[PDB]
């Protein structure tokens, strides 16, 4: 299934501050009104059983725009790399309940890797204790650790609130990260509206990444490499992925230097006029 990613995917093209000016630049962006592929998580159901837990590997292409609405923070992180198998370095980003760790190691990835928080019956607590991205790792080039943070560990299903968007691109071998998080509690699941993403982190790794996979997580379930989506599954969650393309855009900087709007130049003849 596909959904309309109307406006989203715009981010500050550069570090430079600009104000009250319309500047045109060319980078890899998500074309307006492009289809995005919707991935889903379904809880076990009746005999038919809708239940889905979608963690396939997807192509890295030029760059990926990733957005998710999570009932609970089922989605722990992503994997980037060509093989996603050892004997090659691969980017691995996972957030345990405590913090975020980014690591390049030549990990021994499981066939179906995932993470997880388990929800205990006796008490309310949600705890992450399922971490099976990889069996082992060697020759680790770079590693980073974030601060502690709190997220939804427990299994819950729906796209009630948190809306998180990210842009992953490579610039001169650079791995760039952009993000914007806005709650869409009232807001529609993958809403229509415009928001700009700003760069969080710089990863100088220089990994050539062909493909990436998203890692869903729920500690209610145990993990072994070779786990073929068996066992219990996490609450409902949906994430989207789109592909960036070289295109021109006209960005509108407000007084603040915030990007209020944008025009997809190529989108249509009307949009082209706006460009000139």
């Amino acid at each position: 299934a596909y959904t309309n990613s109307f406006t989203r995917g715009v981010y500050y093209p550069d570090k430079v501050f600009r104000s009250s000016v319309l500047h045109s630049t060319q980078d890899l962006f998500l074309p307006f009104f492009s289809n995005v592929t919707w991935f889903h998580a379904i809880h076990v159901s009746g005999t038919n059983g809708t239940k889905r837990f979608d963690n396939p590997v997807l192509p890295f292409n030029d760059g990926v725009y990733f957005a998710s609405t999570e009932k609970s923070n089922i989605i722990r992180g992503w994997i980037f790399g060509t093989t996603l198998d050892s004997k090659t370095q691969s980017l691995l980003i996972v957030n345990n309940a405590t913090n975020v760790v980014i690591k390049v190691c030549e990990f021994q990835f499981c066939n179906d890797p995932f993470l997880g928080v388990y929800y205990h019956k006796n008490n309310k607590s949600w705890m992450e204790s399922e971490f099976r991205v990889y069996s082992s790792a060697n020759n680790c080039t770079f590693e980073y650790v974030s601060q502690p943070f709190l997220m939804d560990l427990e299994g819950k299903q729906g796209n009630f609130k948190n809306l998180r968007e990210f842009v992953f691109k490579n610039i001169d071998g650079y791995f760039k990260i952009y993000s914007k998080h806005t709650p869409i509690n009232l807001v529609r699941d993958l809403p229509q509206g415009f928001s700009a993403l700003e760069p969080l982190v710089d990863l100088p790794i220089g990994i050539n990444i062909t493909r990436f996979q998203t890692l869903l997580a729920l500690h209610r379930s145990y993990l072994t490499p070779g786990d073929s989506s068996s066992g219990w599954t996490a609450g409902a969650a949906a994430y989207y992925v789109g592909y960036l393309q070289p295109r021109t855009f006209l960005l509108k900087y407000n007084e603040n230097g915030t990007i209020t709007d944008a025009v997809d130049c190529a989108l249509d003849p009307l949009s082209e006029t706006k460009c000139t």
Partner: antibody
Framework: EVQLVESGGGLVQPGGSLRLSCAAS????????MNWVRQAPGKGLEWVAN????????YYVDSVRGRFTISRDNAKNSLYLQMNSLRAEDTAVYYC?????????????????WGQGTLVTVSS | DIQMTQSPSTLSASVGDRVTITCRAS??????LAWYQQKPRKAPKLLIY???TLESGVPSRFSGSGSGTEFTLTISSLQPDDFATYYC?????????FGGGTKVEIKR
């Protein structure tokens, strides 16, 4: 016969609590989300609360958030709604309805089956 | 959030005529709209889902269409049974919301 029978309505003073229950039959209860919707007579129909099939994920309307808790006992084939700090405003007829899966998203079917309703009155 | 506003709030039509109730969302719900029929004191019954899919067992007289933000439930040949209040709802995003309700009455 898919059926939903609600019980527990009554007269309640402000501050009080009640728990309504809805016994379901005719389908695999464990596999579906259940919701509680209320119709307060002068006003209209309002969606109160929802629970995921697993029973973990639970959502509520803002007015009720601290006050109401929805829960279910699959073995029991029963759904419950415990209410607290009742206000005069909560007076309404409460219906238990079987909801669609949110996952369906743009193609949501809405609530297929509904119960007769339990009337709760909050007055001094 | 999203507000659904139905119109007209009330209408009276003769038997056999075509009735059209509209519902307008504050913002794009997409296809996420359903319609319900409610009789006095009785619980609501689901007429349509996904804007135009007839629920099982519902009479063919009822149909629902929609595009954009605006959706319409039409009743091709009004019958006396049809007396009721009809509500639209949008499942698109939380919280779930119902329209005000349109009361239909048989004109005599």
């Amino acid at each position: 016969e898919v059926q939903l029978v609600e019980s527990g309505g009554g007269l309640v003073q402000p501050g009080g609590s009640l728990r309504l229950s809805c016994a379901a039959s005719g389908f695999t209860f464990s596999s579906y989300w259940m919701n509680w919707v209320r119709q307060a007579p002068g006003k209209g129909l309002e969606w109160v609360a929802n629970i995921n099939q697993d029973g973990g994920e639970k959502y509520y309307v803002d007015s009720v958030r601290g006050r109401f808790t929805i829960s279910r006992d699959n073995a029991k084939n029963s759904l419950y709604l415990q209410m607290n700090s009742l206000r005069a405003e909560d007076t309404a007829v409460y219906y238990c309805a079987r909801d669609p899966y949110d996952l369906y998203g743009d193609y949501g079917g809405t609530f297929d089956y509904w119960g007769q309703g339990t009337l709760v009155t909050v007055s001094s | 959030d999203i507000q659904m506003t139905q119109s007209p709030s009330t209408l009276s039509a003769s038997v056999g005529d075509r009735v059209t109730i509209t519902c307008r969302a504050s913002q794009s719900i997409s296809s996420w709209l359903a319609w319900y029929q409610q009789k006095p004191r009785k619980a609501p019954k689901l007429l349509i889902y996904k804007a135009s899919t007839l629920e099982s067992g519902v009479p063919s007289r009822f149909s629902g269409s929609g595009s954009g933000t605006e959706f319409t439930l039409t009743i091709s040949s009004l019958q006396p049974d049809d007396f009721a209040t009809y509500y639209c709802q949008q499942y698109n995003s939380y919280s779930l919301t119902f329209g005000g309700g349109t009361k239909v009455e048989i004109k005599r």
